[PDB]
């Protein structure tokens, strides 16, 4: 009662019948695995983006009206 012991014979056929798929990658992949001292900081960076939104909003209208002036000075 001896038997065959191994083979990779038609295996290439099988796992290429559904066509080996390179793993579908999205933008924004998970941060799990990054060192904690990065996250433990970058979460504080993300948590207090809003404190300082007034500067951001007015300074946006500054360049938005300076480039509404830049596109109108071209006109």
């Amino acid at each position: 009662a001896k038997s065959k012991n191994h083979t990779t014979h038609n295996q290439s056929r099988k796992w290429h019948r559904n066509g080996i798929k390179k793993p579908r990658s999205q933008r924004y992949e998970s941060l799990k695995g990054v060192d904690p001292k990065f996250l433990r900081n970058m979460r504080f960076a993300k948590k207090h983006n809003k404190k300082g939104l007034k500067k951001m909003q007015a300074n946006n209208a500054k360049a938005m009206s300076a480039r509404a002036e830049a596109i109108k000075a071209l006109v």
Binding site: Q11, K14, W15, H16, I20, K21, K22, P23
Partner: peptide
Amino acid sequence: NKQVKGKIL
């Protein structure tokens, strides 16, 4: 990427 018996992980 590391190919294993088909599926690439």
